[PDB]
PDB file of C-alpha atoms in Angstrom:
ATOM      1  CA  UNK A   1      13.218   2.633   2.701  1.00 48.68           C
ATOM      2  CA  UNK A   2      14.969  -0.655   1.931  1.00 46.03           C
ATOM      3  CA  UNK A   3      13.532  -3.012  -0.685  1.00 43.78           C
ATOM      4  CA  UNK A   4      10.428  -2.879   1.510  1.00 44.72           C
ATOM      5  CA  UNK A   5       9.700   0.606   0.172  1.00 44.89           C
ATOM      6  CA  UNK A   6      11.047  -0.092  -3.317  1.00 44.24           C
ATOM      7  CA  UNK A   7       8.478  -2.889  -3.528  1.00 46.47           C
ATOM      8  CA  UNK A   8       5.351  -1.084  -2.335  1.00 50.19           C
ATOM      9  CA  UNK A   9       6.357   1.869  -4.510  1.00 50.72           C
ATOM     10  CA  UNK A  10       6.774  -0.274  -7.625  1.00 52.31           C
ATOM     11  CA  UNK A  11       3.477  -1.965  -6.764  1.00 51.50           C
ATOM     12  CA  UNK A  12       1.269   1.120  -7.039  1.00 50.56           C
ATOM     13  CA  UNK A  13       3.276   2.310 -10.042  1.00 48.57           C
ATOM     14  CA  UNK A  14       2.870  -1.142 -11.591  1.00 47.65           C
ATOM     15  CA  UNK A  15      -0.892  -0.605 -11.785  1.00 49.26           C
ATOM     16  CA  UNK A  16      -1.087   3.172 -12.055  1.00 48.20           C
ATOM     17  CA  UNK A  17       0.839   6.073 -10.544  1.00 45.09           C
ATOM     18  CA  UNK A  18      -1.410   8.429  -8.603  1.00 46.86           C
ATOM     19  CA  UNK A  19      -4.138   5.852  -8.026  1.00 45.79           C
ATOM     20  CA  UNK A  20      -5.372   3.570  -5.245  1.00 45.89           C
ATOM     21  CA  UNK A  21      -5.182  -0.178  -4.628  1.00 47.45           C
ATOM     22  CA  UNK A  22      -6.743  -3.029  -2.654  1.00 43.96           C
ATOM     23  CA  UNK A  23      -5.377  -5.510  -0.117  1.00 40.66           C
ATOM     24  CA  UNK A  24      -6.182  -8.478  -2.356  1.00 41.06           C
ATOM     25  CA  UNK A  25      -3.841  -6.894  -4.902  1.00 41.22           C
ATOM     26  CA  UNK A  26      -1.158  -6.043  -2.342  1.00 41.99           C
ATOM     27  CA  UNK A  27      -0.874  -9.369  -0.520  1.00 40.54           C
ATOM     28  CA  UNK A  28      -1.326 -10.988  -3.918  1.00 40.92           C
ATOM     29  CA  UNK A  29       1.590  -9.357  -5.719  1.00 43.16           C
ATOM     30  CA  UNK A  30       3.809  -8.548  -2.736  1.00 44.58           C
ATOM     31  CA  UNK A  31       2.926 -11.986  -1.402  1.00 46.80           C
ATOM     32  CA  UNK A  32       2.849 -10.485   2.083  1.00 45.63           C
ATOM     33  CA  UNK A  33       0.302 -11.097   4.872  1.00 46.47           C
ATOM     34  CA  UNK A  34      -2.697  -8.802   5.320  1.00 46.21           C
ATOM     35  CA  UNK A  35      -1.396  -8.082   8.821  1.00 45.90           C
ATOM     36  CA  UNK A  36       1.784  -6.598   7.355  1.00 42.99           C
ATOM     37  CA  UNK A  37       0.303  -4.442   4.594  1.00 42.65           C
ATOM     38  CA  UNK A  38      -2.297  -3.250   7.099  1.00 41.97           C
ATOM     39  CA  UNK A  39       0.473  -2.310   9.529  1.00 38.26           C
ATOM     40  CA  UNK A  40       2.769  -0.368   7.197  1.00 37.60           C
ATOM     41  CA  UNK A  41      -0.321   1.378   5.831  1.00 39.00           C
ATOM     42  CA  UNK A  42      -1.316   2.701   9.255  1.00 38.88           C
ATOM     43  CA  UNK A  43       2.318   3.320  10.190  1.00 42.78           C
ATOM     44  CA  UNK A  44       3.088   5.350   7.067  1.00 39.86           C
ATOM     45  CA  UNK A  45      -0.151   7.329   7.317  1.00 39.27           C
ATOM     46  CA  UNK A  46       1.231   8.614  10.620  1.00 38.08           C
ATOM     47  CA  UNK A  47       3.103  11.256   8.623  1.00 37.83           C
ATOM     48  CA  UNK A  48       0.072  11.937   6.449  1.00 38.03           C
ATOM     49  CA  UNK A  49       1.511  10.497   3.244  1.00 39.58           C
ATOM     50  CA  UNK A  50      -0.587   7.324   3.303  1.00 41.49           C
ATOM     51  CA  UNK A  51      -4.364   6.894   3.196  1.00 41.25           C
ATOM     52  CA  UNK A  52      -6.923   4.114   3.638  1.00 39.15           C
ATOM     53  CA  UNK A  53     -10.396   4.445   2.121  1.00 38.22           C
ATOM     54  CA  UNK A  54     -12.463   2.897   4.913  1.00 39.70           C
ATOM     55  CA  UNK A  55     -15.960   3.207   3.480  1.00 38.94           C
ATOM     56  CA  UNK A  56     -18.198   2.035   0.647  1.00 38.29           C
ATOM     57  CA  UNK A  57     -15.358   1.341  -1.822  1.00 40.72           C
ATOM     58  CA  UNK A  58     -13.213  -1.476  -0.371  1.00 43.33           C
ATOM     59  CA  UNK A  59      -9.710  -0.123  -0.981  1.00 42.03           C
ATOM     60  CA  UNK A  60      -6.948   2.142   0.323  1.00 42.40           C
ATOM     61  CA  UNK A  61      -5.921   5.653  -0.718  1.00 41.36           C
ATOM     62  CA  UNK A  62      -2.825   7.703  -1.541  1.00 44.68           C
ATOM     63  CA  UNK A  63      -1.569  10.871   0.144  1.00 46.73           C
TER      64      UNK A  63
END
């Protein structure tokens, strides 16, 4: 998608392609609100391409 996607994509690849990340890192770099990152995360996962590790390890996942 527009820059919106180009950003999130470059974010994960900026730390490590094929890995996971945390909100503190997302809202920190992207400078976006936790409400936004949390929305797109659940919205993208709708297709099954996104993932969110909701357990012991506080962080999301990749699909």
